[PDB]
Design an enzyme around this catalytic site. Structure first.
Site, PDB file in Angstrom:
ATOM      1  N   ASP A   1     -22.826  81.093   4.275  1.00  0.00           N
ATOM      2  CA  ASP A   1     -23.177  82.398   4.842  1.00  0.00           C
ATOM      3  C   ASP A   1     -24.254  82.256   5.905  1.00  0.00           C
ATOM      4  O   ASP A   1     -25.447  82.353   5.607  1.00  0.00           O
ATOM      5  CB  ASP A   1     -23.698  83.336   3.752  1.00  0.00           C
ATOM      6  CG  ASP A   1     -23.727  84.777   4.200  1.00  0.00           C
ATOM      7  OD1 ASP A   1     -23.336  85.032   5.360  1.00  0.00           O
ATOM      8  OD2 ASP A   1     -24.136  85.650   3.394  1.00  0.00           O
TER       9      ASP A   1
ATOM     10  N   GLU B   1     -22.813  81.667  -1.512  1.00  0.00           N
ATOM     11  CA  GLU B   1     -22.013  82.819  -1.940  1.00  0.00           C
ATOM     12  C   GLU B   1     -21.578  82.765  -3.405  1.00  0.00           C
ATOM     13  O   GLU B   1     -20.757  83.577  -3.832  1.00  0.00           O
ATOM     14  CB  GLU B   1     -20.757  82.936  -1.057  1.00  0.00           C
ATOM     15  CG  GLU B   1     -20.742  84.122  -0.084  1.00  0.00           C
ATOM     16  CD  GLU B   1     -19.774  83.927   1.087  1.00  0.00           C
ATOM     17  OE1 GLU B   1     -18.680  83.362   0.876  1.00  0.00           O
ATOM     18  OE2 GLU B   1     -20.108  84.344   2.221  1.00  0.00           O
TER      19      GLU B   1
END
Length: 172
Positions: free
Chosen positions: A15, A111
């Protein structure tokens, strides 16, 4: 340093990202970004790691933490740093054992379910997940991959449940 880097790249892939953004005219900006909901995760965990690397590689760029609504971003506008990670991502296959685990730890930290009720990693890039899947099988952790979002082509990597302790045990 090799572990830190691989870890940060796992966080960037999970991310974040590597960006060449337009400043003015034909000038561009090389931005390395890592996003995390928790301000202290970036503050007390990710920033220190990046600072060390930054300083190890002699990047004069400073780290900036921007708070968007709900999430935080860690940025470093550095051509050298952007490329440093760019090459790392090119020769990912040559990752050694300590780097493979580090990479995977950042991918899940990026994540993954901190509760560990769910052990999944998602990516629209299947080829990368598969090299990750082989890294996991190599450490004896059973795992499966399968297209999750068909419209947007996002694949998911699931860690078998009968191997939960094995995963936390191996990535730590």
């Amino acid at each position: 340093v090799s572990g830190i880097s691989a870890y940060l790249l796992g966080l960037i892939i999970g991310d974040g990202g590597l960006y060449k953004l337009k400043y003015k005219g034909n000038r561009s900006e090389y931005r390395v970004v890592i996003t995390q909901k928790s301000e202290n995760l970036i503050k007390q965990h990710i920033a220190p790691l990046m600072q060390f690397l930054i300083d190890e590689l002699n990047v004069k760029s400073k780290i900036q933490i921007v708070k968007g609504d709900t999430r935080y971003e860690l940025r470093v506008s550095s051509k050298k740093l952007y490329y440093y990670f760019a090459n790392m991502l090119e020769r990912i296959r040559l990752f050694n054992m300590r780097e493979q685990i580090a990479f995977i730890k950042g991918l899940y930290v990026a994540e993954g379910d901190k509760t560990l009720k769910r052990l999944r990693i998602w990516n629209k890039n299947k080829a990368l997940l598969e090299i990750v899947s082989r890294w996991l099988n190599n450490l004896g952790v059973r795992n499966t991959i399968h297209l999750d979002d068909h419209r947007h082509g996002v694949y998911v990597l699931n860690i078998s449940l009968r191997d939960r302790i094995k995963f936390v045990h191996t990535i730590l």
